[PDB]
């Protein structure tokens, strides 16, 4: 939410993207395609696995403790035993509630961040050869076949190759 991409300027997610979390759809002379971006996907996944590594399989051993159920009425000492345990449980219950709320807010934001970072990186790559349509899509002002699109996804696109073509298309009348 906090970056504004997921559930923001990207209208919705793609159920048809099953091999990654983030990626690219394109339309060009040769058709309409989709490819996952593995680096952004793995960036998000690694961060979430970091949270899981802190929370899963990390338990504390406890052995002899205090009694926590009682069959006789006893007064003062039993009141204290009960109060200590009820106190403990409320503090842990609070820790667990807050932990999940904060981590979840953060997971939603970090995943939004990874979408935004990929968008930004792609924007800069395109230089003067494309414009941002406001919905996560770039209008590319030159012929850009499957190999050209591939070159953008792979970070090998040379913007100078297309710049004259693109400027001509962009600033026509």
């Amino acid at each position: 939410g906090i970056f504004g991409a997921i559930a923001g300027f990207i209208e919705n997610g793609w159920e048809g993207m099953v091999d990654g979390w983030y990626g690219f759809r394109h339309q060009n002379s040769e058709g309409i395609g989709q490819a996952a971006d593995l680096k952004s996907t793995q960036a998000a996944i690694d961060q979430i696995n970091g949270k899981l590594n802190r929370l899963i399989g990390k338990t504390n051993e406890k052995f002899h403790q205090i009694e926590k159920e009682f069959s006789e009425v006893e007064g003062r000492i039993q009141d204290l035993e009960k109060y200590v345990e009820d106190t403990k449980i409320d503090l842990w219950s609070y820790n667990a509630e807050l932990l999940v709320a904060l981590e979840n807010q953060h997971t939603i934001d970090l995943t939004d961040s990874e979408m935004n970072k990929l968008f930004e990186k792609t924007k800069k790559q395109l230089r003067e050869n494309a414009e941002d349509m406001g919905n996560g899509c770039f209008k590319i002002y030159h012929k850009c076949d499957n190999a050209c699109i591939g070159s953008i996804r792979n970070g090998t696109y040379d913007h100078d190759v297309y710049r004259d073509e693109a400027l001509n298309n962009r600033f026509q009348i």
Partner: protein
């Protein structure tokens, strides 16, 4: 003509609702449960050494109620006390029962070493019909019911030093007779008394003549006490009557042992975390099965479910 290149992210047809700081219900692509809420219902016999008390409380196994004879000298990580347990020897109480139960539980052993106390002036090995051992009147295996010798009973004064490396635990007691029908029969006089001391400690107990409500048809009682004797120290027993004497000492150990009230069956399986409901897996950080646990356990919380988001916000198409 040109091209269009759209950046996007996945979505799933079956998202999961989680809580966040700003929204109690937001759908994400995936989540995982942090609260363990189920048990298989059996206490796994591994990897902790389980001792199923069966019909015996720890205290009954300690004192040596005949039906608990099979418990002699056993050890445990976790002693399991069953709600069906019952006493079937001489009726008794233990002032501060809970503490004795606890310190033995924690010690984690019933290792008992017999000692030769110089008992002269009295008849040893008193028995009763309310404590049947092998179809014959008997008594608590670890206690020695001391009565007269030829209608006579002088003031006992037996000593026992602790030369060991560990705390000795002595269990002893006092008989409270029903009337004069068991005041002049086993002790041979109007009055009796028990003083159990050390270099550091003294406990003195007065017998009480009086009928109690019959428990398994006996109206007299025994009151059970204990005394820890540290290395270099010495136990002393001054008695003028009514002594329920120790036959020796239990070893006190320190370690990770405990006791748990549970009726769950013991199963042939391996689980680090035990609750009274049965063992539970310990992958999750929290659990709402039971506040009583033993072993490497998730922490008890009040919530039934806490979902940790493991994916992005789910924004369907």
């Amino acid at each position: 003509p040109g091209a269009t290149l759209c950046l996007g992210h996945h979505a799933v047809p079956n998202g999961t609702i989680v809580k966040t700081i700003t929204n109690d219900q937001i759908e994400v692509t995936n989540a995982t449960e942090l609260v363990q809420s189920s048990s298989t219902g059996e206490i796994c016999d591994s990897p902790h050494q389980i001792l199923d008390g069966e019909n015996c409380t720890l205290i009954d196994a300690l004192l040596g109620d005949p039906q608990c004879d099979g418990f002699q000298n056993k050890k445990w990580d976790l002693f399991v006390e069953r709600s069906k347990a019952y006493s079937n020897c001489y009726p008794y109480d233990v002032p501060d029962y809970a503490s004795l139960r606890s310190l033995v539980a924690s010690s984690g052993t019933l290792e008992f070493n017999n000692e030769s106390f110089n008992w002269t002036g009295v008849t040893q090995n008193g028995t009763s019909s309310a404590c049947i051992r092998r179809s014959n009147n008997s008594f608590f295996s670890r206690l020695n019911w001391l009565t007269h010798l030829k209608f006579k009973y002088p003031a006992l004064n037996v000593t026992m030093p602790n030369n060991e490396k560990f705390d000795k635990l002595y269990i002893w007691g006092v008989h409270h007779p029903v009337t004069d029908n068991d005041q002049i029969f086993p002790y041979a006089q109007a009055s009796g008394r028990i003083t159990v001391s050390t270099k550091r400690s003294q406990q003195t107990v007065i017998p009480n003549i009086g009928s109690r409500p019959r428990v398994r048809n006996i109206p007299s009682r025994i009151s059970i006490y204990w005394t820890i004797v540290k290395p270099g120290d010495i136990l002393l027993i001054n008695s003028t009557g009514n002594l329920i004497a120790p036959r020796g000492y239990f070893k006190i150990r320190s370690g990770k042992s405990s006791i748990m009230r549970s009726d769950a069956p013991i199963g042939k399986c391996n689980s680090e975390c035990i609750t009274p409901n049965g063992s539970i897996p310990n992958d999750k950080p929290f659990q709402n099965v039971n506040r009583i646990t033993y072993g490497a356990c998730p922490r008890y919380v009040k919530q039934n479910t806490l979902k940790l988001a493991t994916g992005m916000r789910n924004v369907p198409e």
